[PDB]
């Protein structure tokens, strides 16, 4: 894949600005960051800054607060403003103002989606009446938000597509997993859910209640995309809100590692006295899985990464792809090992992932442009080899792909058709179209 395109200061972009160096070059380093996430109150006093300290960002957030106060006095809320290569996107959620400052050539829609995900995390930690009453506010949530924003900066396909990934299990094996995971329903579980390394495995559901995709994204961005599930390697009775299910219901989540890549079990209950009961869940689940050897199958399927693009489609020129089912609201992709040379450090793979994700981001901006009904978008970056990319946005699915620059339009649109055929061939395997009883 083409190296050294577009931005060039991302190798240290995730590195936090130290506090030892004086405040002048400290603010210079903060402003030099490619991406900024800020949360401020109605009065505009600083609430949360992704990179800088609150005192450092106080002046910047005061200036933007004066701007927003004048616009609110003018009855015209601000939705963002563009200064050349940089773009400011502001989303108005109650007393809170969320601003995302992007130098990575990202559209208004993607920044709004990321700010909405941060707001959903805040709403999940603090219930909506409490969110209105606070106008402390982010106790414990600051690290989760910082890590989730870092995941956004590195390129998060799940937030781009507003969908989730899957483990790619055989339909028979996944059906057996769901059957076992429902045979221990305990007559108490509200939302059952099982994940292997950020990839959803199985879901059991009540008859009337439906597990909304927004709740799925909220849970996944809380646990796996933010990586806040790490460190609490044990019994976790985490409080929850699930605003899609109810914006005032203060639900409860049971999280425990399947260490009996790292499989996690997520169980939602509306009662706080049910943790022990959900404890009687997990063992009755785990042993059953350990009786069937299935948990080993989940561990092995998660241990091996995304399927290789050559293995998915033999003799293909595509280097990567990103398929997404709208009706199943779930996505998948090929491995990123093919993007980088086999001997690669964290920096090289990180840069390659960010670069590929920026290509997908500009393609998604092209397809998902309001007042613009674009079905297929193709682009070719020169990279003085080259790179080519296509995005298909039919009402049935959504495909993104990347190939070397020497393919041509038809020579890789054929590959897009082939990967669509592969995805619809394994729609049962790659996605959880249903759930439980």
């Amino acid at each position: 894949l083409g190296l050294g395109e577009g931005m060039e200061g991302f190798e240290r972009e995730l590195d936090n600005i130290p506090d030892t160096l004086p405040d002048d070059e400290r603010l210079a380093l903060w402003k030099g960051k490619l991406k900024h996430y800020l949360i401020l109150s109605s009065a505009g006093k600083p609430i949360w800054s992704r990179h800088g300290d609150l005192s450092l960002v106080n002046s910047t957030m005061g200036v933007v607060q004066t701007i927003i106060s004048f616009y609110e006095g003018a009855r015209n809320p601000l939705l963002g403003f563009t200064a050349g290569k940089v773009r400011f996107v502001i989303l108005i959620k109650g007393p809170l103002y969320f601003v995302a400052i992007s130098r990575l050539r990202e559209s208004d829609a993607q920044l709004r989606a990321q700010l909405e995900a941060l707001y959903m995390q805040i709403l999940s930690t603090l219930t909506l009446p409490i969110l209105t009453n606070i106008f402390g506010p982010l106790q414990g949530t600051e690290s989760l938000l910082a890590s989730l924003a870092d995941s956004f900066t590195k390129g998060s396909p799940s937030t781009l597509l507003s969908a989730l990934e899957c483990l790619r299990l055989r339909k028979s094996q996944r059906q057996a997993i769901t059957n076992i995971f429902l045979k221990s329903r305990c007559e108490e579980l509200l939302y059952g859910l099982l994940v292997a390394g950020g990839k959803l495995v199985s879901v059991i559901r009540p008859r009337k209640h439906s597990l909304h995709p927004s709740d799925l994204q909220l849970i996944f961005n809380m646990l796996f995309e933010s990586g806040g599930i790490k460190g609490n390697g044990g019994e976790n009775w985490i409080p929850l809100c699930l605003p899609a299910f109810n914006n005032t219901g203060y639900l409860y989540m049971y999280v425990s590692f399947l260490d009996d890549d790292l499989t996690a079990l997520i169980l939602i209950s509306p009662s706080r006295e049910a943790f022990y009961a959900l404890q009687s869940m997990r063992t009755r689940l785990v042993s059953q899985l350990l009786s069937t050897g299935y948990l080993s199958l989940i561990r092995s399927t998660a241990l091996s990464g995304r399927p290789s693009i050559t293995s998915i489609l033999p003799k293909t020129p595509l280097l990567h792809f990103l398929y997404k089912s709208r009706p199943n609201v779930q996505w998948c992709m090929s491995s990123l090992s093919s993007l980088t040379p086999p001997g690669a450090t964290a920096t090289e793979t990180l840069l390659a992932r960010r670069k590929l994700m920026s290509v997908y981001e500009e393609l998604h901006a092209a397809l998902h442009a309001r007042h613009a009904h674009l079905r297929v978008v193709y682009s070719t970056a020169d990279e003085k080899e080259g790179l080519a990319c296509l995005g298909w946005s039919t009402p049935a699915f959504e495909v993104y792909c990347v190939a070397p620059g020497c393919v041509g339009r038809a020579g890789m649109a054929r590959e897009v058709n082939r990967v669509v055929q592969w995805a619809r061939r394994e729609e049962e395997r790659l996605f959880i179209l249903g759930g439980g009883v």
């Binding site: 004066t66 004048f70 200064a83 050349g84 400011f88 092209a366 007042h371």
Partner: protein, 454 residues
């Protein structure tokens, strides 16, 4: 009963003009709102000024704020709920702040911008208007200030921009794809053939118009372009062609630019003024009135002058324009300021009518020259020479092969994906549609913009 997306306000302000507190009021060198522009449209308080100064002050606040973030780039656009504001630095220290209210759909209103011009296109239109203002006034706004004085600059800006904003339509209209690059819009024939053996492409007319600038004194440049069609041999032969306030057609454009002696940036402005004359005859700036003796001559030499920049291989010149008008052609002849004295103008006009009348029929034939699954509409924009040749049809008025809604949709997609790829001042940004429109944009110094239909 929806409300059209009329522009909210437009402000021309120089921050350096007002430094102290009591001199803040002179920062706004021009300000206009729809209430102010109603009188200008029909022709064609302390709290209000307090709002104006707050608006320009917070525009300056955003540019100061984002100067650090963008590392030397001001806030180009501002997206709000009910106003698509843009702020364009036309020149060093001079800014145009224009807020365009979106469509208010029913007092709870639902806001939308389906047909509102994109901020890149709005910036292009404001830059075009600024270039026209410089064409008719001085070399630059800073020079105009430092020469004339603030009162004269305010008066001239007020007149020109009231007229423009009265005539300005902020919705999608005409051919924005030609207008998003600016540039010199060429006709369907494009340009007259220069070499020998291209008589069908206009070699003889090219030679005659080339030798005209030496045959008559004072004349430096001849700019002619086809706008409309040949005269109709009917009752109303006039047809009011020179006015009509309409839009330039896809086949309407310059057919013969100058020999040289004039910078291509100024040639763009001259061609745009010629388009304004075609659209706003008897109403464009300078008040072009047809000569009572012969209706051919418009804006006679017998004063009025326009400001251009000349080619270095030949500098601001302040040439005097004269607009010879045939029914399909608009010859703009730019004379020197001092050598063709107006006393000889009645004779010289006759000589002009002697040397341009035999260039009606042959040049009409020459301009008729015309240079693929169903239909191919490509837009070739030469960056170096600023020439734009577009086969893409313009948006119809409220037979044409397009309909209004399809034109709006596909045309909004065209310049949107142009803005995505930074086309505006290989890159094969091919884009398909659900309606069968196949855009192929390539970067060659040509901004090729092919667009297949169905």
């Amino acid at each position: 009963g929806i409300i059209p997306a009329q522009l909210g306000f437009l402000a021309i302000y120089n921050p350096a003009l007002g430094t102290t507190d009591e001199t803040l009021e002179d920062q706004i060198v021009y300000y206009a709102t729809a209430s102010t522009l109603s009188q200008a449209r029909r022709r064609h308080s302390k709290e209000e000024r307090h709002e104006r100064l707050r608006q320009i002050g917070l525009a300056q606040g955003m540019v100061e704020f984002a100067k650090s973030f963008s590392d030397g780039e001001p806030v180009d656009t501002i997206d709000t709920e009910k106003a698509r504001v843009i702020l364009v630095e036309v020149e060093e220290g001079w800014w145009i702040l224009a807020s365009i209210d979106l469509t208010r759909l029913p007092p709870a209103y639902e806001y939308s911008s389906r047909e509102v011009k994109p901020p890149s296109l709005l910036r292009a239109d404001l830059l075009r208007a600024y270039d026209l203002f410089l064409l008719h006034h001085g070399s630059s706004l800073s020079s105009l200030l430092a020469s004339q004085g603030r009162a004269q600059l305010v008066a001239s800006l007020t007149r020109f921009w009231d007229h423009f904003l009265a005539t300005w339509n902020v919705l999608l209209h005409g051919n924005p794809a030609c207008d998003v690059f600016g540039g010199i819009k060429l006709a369907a024939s494009g340009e007259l053939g220069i070499g020998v053996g291209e008589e069908e492409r206009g070699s003889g007319e090219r030679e005659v118009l080339e030798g005209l600038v030496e045959r008559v004194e004072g004349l430096v440049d001849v700019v002619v372009g086809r706008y409309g069609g040949p005269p109709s041999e009917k009752g109303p032969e006039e047809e009011q062609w020179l006015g009509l306030g309409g839009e330039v057609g896809e086949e309407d454009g310059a057919v013969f630019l100058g020999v040289g002696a004039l910078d291509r940036k100024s040639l763009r402005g001259v061609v745009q003024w010629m388009e304004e004359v075609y659209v706003w005859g008897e109403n464009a700036f300078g008040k072009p009135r047809r000569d009572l003796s012969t209706g051919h001559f418009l804006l006679g030499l017998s004063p009025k002058a326009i400001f251009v920049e000349l080619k270095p291989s030949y500098h601001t010149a302040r040439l005097r324009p004269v607009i010879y008008v045939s029914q399909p052609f608009i010859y703009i002849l730019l004379f020197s300021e001092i050598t063709p004295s107006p006393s000889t103008w009645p004779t010289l006009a006759e000589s002009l009518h002697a040397q341009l009348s035999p260039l009606q029929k042959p040049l009409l034939h020459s301009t008729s020259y015309r240079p693929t699954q169903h239909q191919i509409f490509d837009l070739v924009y030469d960056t170096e020479t600023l020439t734009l040749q577009s086969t893409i049809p313009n948006i119809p008025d409220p037979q044409s092969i397009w309909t209004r809604v399809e034109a709006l949709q596909t045309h909004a997609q065209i310049l949107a994906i142009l803005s995505s790829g930074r086309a505006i001042p290989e890159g094969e940004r091919t884009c398909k549609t659900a309606r069968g429109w196949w855009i192929v944009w390539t970067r060659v110094g040509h901004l090729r913009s092919v667009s297949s239909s169905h």
